[PDB]
From a paper:
Visual inspection and 2D class averaging of purified BAV YN15-126-01 virions on cryo-EM micrographs revealed two types of virions: one surrounded by more spikes on the viral surface (hereafter referred to as full particles), and the other with sparser spiky density (partial particles). In the full BAV virions, there are 60 spikes sitting on VP10A and VP10B, respectively, while in the partial virions, there are only 60 spikes on VP10A. In contrast, in the double-layered full BAV particles, 120 spikes made up of a VP4 trimer (for membrane penetration) and VP9 (for receptor binding) emanate from VP10 located at both type II and type III channels. Local reconstructions focused on the fivefold vertices produced a clear map at 2.6 Å resolution for tracing most residues of VP2, VP4, VP8, and VP10 in the icosahedral asymmetrical unit (ASU). VP4 trimers are situated in the cavity formed by six VP8 trimers and directly interact with VP10A or VP10B. The C3 symmetry is broken for the three N-terminal tails (various numbers of residues were traced) within one VP4 trimer, which are involved in forming the asymmetric interface between the VP4 trimer and VP10 monomer. Despite the symmetry mismatch between the VP4 trimer and VP10 monomer, the interface is similar for VP10A and VP10B. The VP4 trimer has an overall negatively charged patch near its C3 axis at the VP4–VP10 interface, while positively charged residues R65 and R121 are present on the VP10 side. At physiological pH, VP4 (pI = 5.9, negatively charged) would electrostatically interact with the basic VP10 protein (pI = 9.0), suggesting that electrostatic interactions between the VP4 trimer and VP10 may play an important role in association of spikes on the virus surface. Binding of VP4 trimers also results in a total ~1800 Å2 of buried surface area on VP8 molecules surrounding VP10A, which is ~10% more than for VP8 surrounding VP10B ( ~ 1600 Å2), likely contributing to different affinity of VP4 trimers for the outer capsid shell in the full BAV particles.
Banna virus (BAV) is the prototype Seadornavirus, a class of reoviruses for which there has been little structural study. Here, we report atomic cryo-EM structures of three states of BAV virions—surrounded by 120 spikes (full virions), 60 spikes (partial virions), or no spikes (cores). In the full and partial BAV virions, genomic dsRNA segments and a number of RNA-dependent RNA polymerases (RdRps, VP1) are packaged in a double-layered icosahedral capsid consisting of three proteins (VP2, VP8, and VP10). The spikes protruding from the outer capsid shell are heterohexamers composed of a VP4 trimer capped by a VP9 trimer.
Numbering used by the authors:
A (entry chain W): 287 to 400
B (entry chain Q): 1 to 233
C (entry chain U): 25 to 58
D (entry chain H), H (entry chain J): 2 to 300
E (entry chain F), G (entry chain K): 2 to 299
F (entry chain P): 1 to 249
């Protein structure tokens, strides 16, 4: 079973993004980066795209985002529409490349929707 | 129960010709394999009995959507009696016979990239008995000769010496080899009277025991119930 | 959760950096640049 | 603001999704019917000092004749029933009973596996949340009868919000001293001892005067569809027996004092309607378990 | 250091040692069997609009036909059943019923007086001791559901030791707020609402943070071997009937709210396994007393 | 076994007349009477079963050498079937019958200082059943009549309410009272209920069931005397007679 | 701190998963029964001065008459018994015996094949861990009798922790000189030579005074369910015979001095109750191997 | 001087003084004979696939017909044997078996109560005391084979006195290195690896040179009169079984690893000739106990 969770805290921004992919079902939630108490690292959710579980247990890999929150959200919305018509490797490979390398997806149709 | 009853290579090949791929695929959602679990065996122990789940158990399990998952589902049906949950394969593919999938190119399936070592490890070949292993090697030879991978099958057998001793003596595409084959492949047969209605410790042994005990009842009553639904189709 | 394919699991597999010529060329260049 | 919730409502673990088809439901009903025969035959065998009534019932139940050398544990029917019980409790428990064995054991007796013929009443009171101001302390204790102890130390009277789950039909509140309770944006009535509430109407507000504490005792009644053979007395006994034998010892699962707490907690989670159907089948299975173990004892 | 214990576990009085042989056990079984038919005869009387089913059941129970002149009492069986109940409760109660009378009454119906065919689950929560440090208050209240209220007024967190005995099988602890519990010489886990414990594991330490009080609700399950005819609903009703009818008013005896509390208290006493067998037979006797007296009030 | 089978006052006193004191005394060492012990009862429990040994068990125990131990050995023989270990009593006392010790001054034994309350407590009267208490009260009355302590016997009955209700009614000097008495004193007998070859938990109950099961075997054994079929073969001296009188009564 | 563990408890290799079903269990029981008759028939032949009793026994076991010019090997039954012994030891063994061959050999005699009709006592002592502080040296020698030698070099007395596992039933500790031992959180008693312990009662602390070394001799008894035909003397002989014949010579396996050490080591492995059932069937097969090979040497 | 003694020889607790007459000795022999029939019948039932041989032997042993749903424990005979075993071990154990029960069970089978027909060899090594000088260290470990480790730190050679008692017949001494041993007031012989000794010869002196430690391995053999039915393997198995079941858990008693240690320890105590007679009956009783439980097991 393959499941994956991404928590993006953009330093150059006021909003954060949580992306969860369980199999071929993609869900996201945009959260505020202000007003957070010490208990939780996430503020109130401003935009919702499903239900995301941040209490998932597993290996944690730390990375620094190379795109803004708006750019990450744009690809996430496009990936949600193409979740059924894309493989999990394509769904992941396109997301990781854009977040970590600022590399735009090779799929021209997916690139246009973003 | 029908597939496990075949005891000869020519009976097994005949059964696969008449059996659609639908019978090798389960519609039950099942559980994820390779999980360390505690099961209850109260006939023997008061405490829970450790065991690990596997694809070659008699119970349906969740399967992958790739071609590897479909081949594993076919082999599990042959060696264990039940398939796996692979949803929405396709009406055209599910109507084709199991032998058509393994030995014919008209199906539209590509199996050249299959690694026989990986498939064996996923099916827990170390836990399979001699009859189960011989059935699995039959499916590998049929897939190898379809793809032109006869050399790879032989090289794979050289690496695994214990599998080489029990390799079936038949060449696909030659009718003489099938006629004169003298292999015994019957997992389930009419039980020796010594068999009792008792549980077994392992998951595999108990499920195999369940098929053995219910074969006599299935043999007597399957024909009428099959015909009661088959007629006026 | 939908059924899981094997696409993601093949990506995170380790690679033979010594046997592959392209991978060896790349690490020699970075070591030189550093 | 402070938030208080019932202990048993916290994080209901997912239940099994296997053995819920029509054929599996028939197997559970057959096991309950045959277990009832087994417990009755043991009574007749003890009275008459003969093993004939017990041998006939055990052979029907286990498809095998009792032997002095071996041990009588119920046979293959007992093995399937115990392993299916674990599957219902958690999704982490595996499914290891083949469908051939389920179909074979369901043919022993002819019954209708309908789990919605009748209804049963469960008395667990769900308090989803109680919200209190800064200077008030609220404590929730109990499941069958919830006692909520509240003390106000601030200068002014405090408004405390009571949220009962939308599932429960009726909630009755009794206080140690008369108190005022009213719906949201509704006038406060005169202080009285007893209130009858329908949780679906909305959140409730309780006015706490400064001074001596006020304790509120809550009772609830919920109707859940069950088969006609359902017996709460036998189901409760089976639930404790399964826990003591270690059947529910699965990883990452929650534990409950009674079957009433289990069924109500699973109802109040998301996809609760789907979860309750599995719990009802588990209730019948536990009823069959209790009658089987009492008939065949292990010291 | 303060010590708190359950109120119902204190000083169990010795139970009687008479009427616990095979002959007397079958007498209690016969009384339970024949009292059940006495109740069932009333339903049969309604269907036929005749009193002849009740006359037949009463005659077998009382060795005499019922009379309209006098109140139905049950005869010699009722007198014998009442006296053995008194003897079971206390050792000081006399054993006045002769063996010959028990011999004759046990021959009325065919039964085996075996009290170890089945098991029953008793829900009393045994808390032998709760050890608390200074400047902390601990209150234990309840038997079926034990609520332990703990408040510490000290500077730092205090450790509370819980001792649930060695007889109970399963104890479930539920807190008003999440708390930390672990066995002796074990690391303390994250705060959690519900703990499942086995009393044989050992003493348990609970961290009590300074601030609002913490209340822990305890539920227990104990398995005790009982005859197949045992019915907890009827035994509990018979216990209340016997107490109200003055069958337990003997000198130097303890009183309990339910048969659940009575059987667990004697179990946890010193050499308590001797008392469990006698208390089980008393429970079956109370089951017969409940049915016999409901059919024939006096 | 034979003493436990007697069911009437006439049979009990007749047996005691023909039974010497040496049958009451046991020559096995036994164990000390009052001890908290753990015994094995594997039919019911895996763990050891606590119990307390006592003098009214069916197994011999060690007894005090005083006169108190001798009387306490006689009563334990009557109510439990076995006595205690009191050796070197002497030929003169041991050859006398049990009735002679309890009722006659010519034996040479002095028993007027005995306290019925202390003897009853040492014999664990609380653990005794109805038949056992009736049998012990018979022994007390015979001792009281021997010592002229009839008033003391009545006061002891007044203090103990349960003992007064079951006190047998007979004058220890008149045979007419013994014949009229209809109290049932049998401890073992033919059982009307179902008697099984199963163990009991306590020492007293388990030992009692051994005598009950042994009596059934004794009843069908060749040693048992069947009055209905072999009355003519019995000797005239010990043959049953309607006008049977104890000597001096 | 230092940790000491028994040599034979380290790294139990995985055991085979084949020939453990009901049909295969009967074959092992059949081989044991027929092998015993071979030994008895040879004794009868020697006494009676006739080879007729031996010919019948060999024909039943080997399906062929003995011949003077053909080596007596035991036939196909001997080959099947040898191969299943190899499979039981390790999962890497070939396990090539067909099911049709096993079934036909189980029809030669009627036996239940039940491996839980009786029990056997195993004497290997399992010291899972001995935890010692600094300036102390601890050595563990032996399996059937474990000698623990401890030296205290430091200034004061040291506490040493003993862990005997949770499987062994009882453990007896004997010392060269009187010593103090107590459970965790328990007062130490007066020094005495012999201690009887229950391994399930937590770790045990031993006080080590400064001075001469203290040696503790440990003996343990464990009960494992075995078939009624189990004989420890014959199983031990077969285990030694199988090692010398090379039946256990497979890659990535562990070797033990006796079948006592083999079964206890597999019991203490993680999920070791799975392996204990297979080890008992292996022991029965070795019992058949010893009798058959002694009657028909090769 | 320093004194070292074997651990198992220290403080033998008194054995019971009950059930040692001819009638009780017959009962133990009868139980052993009947237990052997019980274990053989169970083997015959397995080979014949019929419970008739086992039911046939259980009826003689337990005087009752086996019934389903009731645990087979051995009947009244098992109750008597188990409790008599406890009395043999310790004098503090109660005597609770009536004489009527012993006589009835002793009449079931014809057999002699003779306990002195044959003999057996016991291998426990009695080292009553080892006396050593100031600058030497002596350690004794083991019972079946006793290793005595001696280290000399003084300037010159030291003399160690060995006392093996008066009961053992022969003692064989083997050393890690050649050593000199002689009796009291006897010239020392040349260094030798092995010595065969008679314990009645007297105290033995060992010369311990300065240097590497010297380890002496001791093996002993003694003859004790036992009945012909005695089997050492069966007695030892029963001893461990009785320990596991807890029959030997009595106050103020000493625990031994083997029956060989137990019988030798009681032999070397005062009035050991009388103690050893009781121990022999206990060994036969343990042989009956071992065969009874192996025929009728409990999980």
């Amino acid at each position: 079973a393959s499941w994956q969770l991404y928590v993006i805290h953009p330093v150059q921004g006021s909003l954060g993004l949580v992306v969860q992919l369980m199999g071929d079902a993609l869900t996201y939630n945009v959260f505020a980066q202000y007003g957070n108490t010490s208990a939780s690292e996430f503020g109130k959710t401003v935009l919702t795209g499903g239900a995301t579980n941040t209490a998932l247990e597993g290996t944690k890999v730390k990375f620094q985002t190379k795109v803004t929150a708006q750019q990450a959200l744009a690809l996430t919305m496009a990936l949600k529409d193409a979740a059924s018509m894309l493989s999990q490797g394509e769904l992941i490979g396109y997301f990781e490349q854009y977040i970590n390398l600022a590399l735009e997806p090779d799929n021209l149709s997916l690139q246009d929707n973003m | 129960m029908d597939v496990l009853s075949k005891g000869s290579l020519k009976e097994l090949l005949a059964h696969l010709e008449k059996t659609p791929l639908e019978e090798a695929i389960s519609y039950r959602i099942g559980t994820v394999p390779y999980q360390n679990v505690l099961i209850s065996r109260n006939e023997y122990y008061n405490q829970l009995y450790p065991d690990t789940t596997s694809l070659i158990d008699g119970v349906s399990r969740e399967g992958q959507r790739n071609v590897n998952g479909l081949i594993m589902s076919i082999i599990s049906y042959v060696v264990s009696g039940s398939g796996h949950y692979i949803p929405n394969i396709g009406f055209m593919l599910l109507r084709r016979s199991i032998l058509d999938i393994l030995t014919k190119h008209d199906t539209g399936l590509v199996t050249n990239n299959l690694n026989y070592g990986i498939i064996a490890r996923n099916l827990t070949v170390s836990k399979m008995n001699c009859e189960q292993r011989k059935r699995m090697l039959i499916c590998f030879k049929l897939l190898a000769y379809k793809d032109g991978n006869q050399n790879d099958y032989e090289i794979y057998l050289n690496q695994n010496i214990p599998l080489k001793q029990i390799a079936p003596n038949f060449i696909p595409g030659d009718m003489r080899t099938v006629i004169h084959n003298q292999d015994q492949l019957a997992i389930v047969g009419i039980p020796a009277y010594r068999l009792t209605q008792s549980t077994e410790l392992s998951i595999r042994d108990d499920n195999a025991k369940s098929y053995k005990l219910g074969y006599v009842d299935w043999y007597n009553s399957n024909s009428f119930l099959r015909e009661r639904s088959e007629f006026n189709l | 959760r939908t059924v899981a394919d094997g696409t993601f699991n093949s990506m995170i597999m380790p690679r033979a950096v010594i046997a592959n010529e392209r991978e060896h060329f790349m690490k020699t260049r970075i070591d030189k640049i550093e | 603001a402070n938030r208080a919730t019932s202990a048993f409502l916290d994080n209901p673990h997912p239940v099994g999704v296997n053995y819920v088809d029509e054929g599996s439901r028939q197997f559970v009903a057959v096991a309950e019917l045959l277990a009832s025969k087994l417990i009755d035959s043991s009574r007749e065998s003890d009275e008459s000092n003969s093993d004939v009534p017990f041998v006939q019932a055990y052979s029907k139940f286990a498809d095998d004749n009792p032997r002095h050398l071996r041990v009588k544990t119920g046979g293959k029917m007992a093995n399937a029933l115990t392993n299916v019980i674990r599957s219902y409790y958690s999704i982490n428990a595996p499914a290891i009973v083949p469908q051939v064995e389920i179909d074979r054991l369901a043919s022993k007796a002819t019954v209708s596996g309908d789990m919605y013929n009748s209804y049963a009443i469960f008395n667990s009171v769900p308090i989803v949340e109680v919200l209190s101001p800064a200077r008030t302390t609220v404590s929730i204790v109990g499941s069958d009868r919830a006692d909520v102890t509240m003390l106000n130390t601030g200068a002014g009277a405090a408004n405390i919000t009571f949220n009962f789950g939308q599932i429960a039909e009726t909630v009755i509140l009794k206080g140690s001293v008369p108190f005022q309770l009213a719906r949201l944006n509704q006038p406060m009535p005169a202080a009285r001892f007893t209130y009858k509430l329908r949780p679906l109407d909305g959140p409730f507000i309780v006015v706490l005067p400064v001074g001596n504490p006020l304790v509120i005792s809550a009772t609830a009644a919920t109707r859940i569809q069950v088969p006609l053979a359902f017996n709460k007395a036998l189901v409760e006994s089976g639930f404790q027996t399964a826990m003591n034998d270690g059947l529910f010892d699965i990883q990452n699962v929650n534990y409950y004092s009674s079957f009433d707490e289990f069924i109500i907690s699973q109802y109040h989670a998301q996809d609760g309607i789907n979860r309750v159907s599995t719990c009802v089948i588990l209730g019948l299975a536990l009823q069959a378990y209790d009658q089987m173990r009492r008939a065949l004892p292990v010291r």
